[PDB]
Assembly symmetry: C3
Homo-oligomer: 238 residues x 3
């Protein structure tokens, strides 16, 4: 009665992914998938003699989808947080990060501190339902919060002047500062908070143990560092 045994008997691993967060997970117009976490899902599946079955989900529906048992694991640039820990498990962490501003490079100097960001005529854009929204709501008393449903296009909103900044994971701020030359990542090396990425798991001890063992070896063998570099350098569209 571990889903580790179910997966091993099945030969199927159901991996949920949002498809909306480069460099971790991106759903093409074709209807396939790329990125570091999709790449890693194929690896986890293989290690189990299993076929990778990609289950679409979204930031707003992640925990509903989780509660409903639509998937065995979620692999999608997911931050660890305690709200999520209330219901699910996380794997050991594969990345350390934190929220930081991305804004027009000209504006950069305005938005160094949350003191400067949280002001009556400032508009911070966020995608709904995840840690970006949570951070914005927890920390902005005075700035307006513009909820934009499509995270793939959220950075174009900043370019197009529809909002002054977004606070998002610094890895996403660094990459999008490359995909949209107008945008700058603000002190990505000194984020406003601490958070880790990990894989979202059922409350299942044996399956967490297997996943963590697989991830620890991927990490210590350097295979993890190398696939991330590959996906950071990859030719993402905009």
């Amino acid at each position: 009665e571990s889903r580790l045994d179910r997966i091993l008997e099945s030969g199927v691993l159901r991996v949920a992914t949002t498809g909306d967060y480069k460099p971790f997970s991106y759903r093409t117009e074709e209807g396939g998938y790329a990125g570091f976490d999709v790449d890693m899902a194929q690896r986890l599946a293989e290690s189990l003699g299993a076929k990778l079955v990609v289950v679409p989900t979204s930031w707003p529906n992640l925990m509903r989808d989780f509660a409903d048992d639509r998937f065995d694991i979620a692999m999608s640039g997911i931050s660890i947080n305690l709200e999520r820990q209330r219901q699910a498990y996380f794997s050991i962490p594969y990345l350390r990060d934190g929220k930081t501003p991305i804004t027009l490079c000209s504006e950069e100097a305005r938005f160094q501190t949350l003191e400067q960001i949280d002001q009556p005529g400032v508009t911070a854009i966020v995608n709904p339902g995840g840690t970006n929204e949570k951070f914005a709501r927890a920390n902005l008393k005075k700035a307006r919060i513009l909820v934009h449903p499509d995270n793939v296009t959220i950075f174009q909103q900043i370019v197009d002047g529809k909002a002054d900044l977004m606070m998002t994971d610094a890895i996403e701020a660094r990459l999008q500062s490359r995909l949209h030359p107008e945008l700058c990542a603000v002190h990505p090396q000194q984020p406003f908070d601490f958070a880790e990425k990990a894989y979202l798991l059922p409350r299942d001890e044996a399956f967490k143990r297997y996943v963590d063992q697989w991830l620890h070896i991927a990490e210590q063998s350097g295979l993890l560092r190398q696939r991330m570099e590959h996906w950071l350098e990859y030719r993402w569209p905009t």
Copy 2:
């Protein structure tokens, strides 16, 4: 069927504490509580949307109280040891330490090594029922062992000459060398053994996972280092 779910449905977290071990836990004459671990309990409770309910316990009764399910977690400068691990779980560790002497500063040079401590006319004082007593009994063949029930006043016994030394956690030896100017901590940086402080938990996987996740973030965010400093500098009475 995790007590994580019970606590979340309840809105109550029952935290056991001894109230007798500054800087971790101190029960006032009023009948309230202070210290690093009480401070941390409030934090754990909050993170869970729960009310902190402080359950009194003592070193002699800790494991009896634990077996009886009087509390959800114990947070009280508790050392990890295998005897305790027989019945309970521990969280990940928040402090590394070890047993070391505290004695009259004049006597300091007599009591550097266990060779010197363990002698026919030496009296080592300990509080009963915990790792201090266990260490003393495990390691003294020749010194007398004076069991003093009130750990709040045990250091005054050394000042008052009722015993020659105590071997206790070096963090408690450093602080009490400050609260009682007559006492010196002996090589606190080189303890006689290795031990960690952690929180005492039921055999409940999901609740340990939540607690460890919360503690790891408290630690990596530096919030842990900062509350300890605050409680080390606090104006404890004697």
Copy 3:
């Protein structure tokens, strides 16, 4: 319903060991046992107030013996791998290592890389049923693979010219380069892969927790580093 409780009620710990892998586990002609992991088993048993009961097993039968519940733990220079993780748990790791060549010192320079090893007239010897065999089969397309059932005598096969090399854990390559002066360990410091040694455990959470707690203290107290040195320097026969 943890085997931690069964062992504590019993006063018995059943430890499986192969007896065929110095410096971890060696079964004498008398029919007793030596090595680092046997030494550690006595320690684990003691910590539990239990008697050590040594259960013989072998690389080919390890997982069959495990599935049949012939033992509570296996302690025998066992590598972590995911195949094994499918069915069992591992403790936290006590050693980091990797596969590397051991060959006649004269030949050393031929067998630096797997490019050089995997050639039509090369014969790599392995013992059956474990990670050495798995590695050899996974990585040799062109070299022949000679399966030798007795790991105690496998290194003498290289001395006797019956095979050109073995790829085995670098700790075993370093020690056998000492026991058989004709053999050299090839870049033991740069193995061909990454692997850890750990103890093989039932899917039992409370018992893993106890074991890991015991091992973490053995490690952090330096007791682990010191017993390994002792068994590396020990006067093994050949």
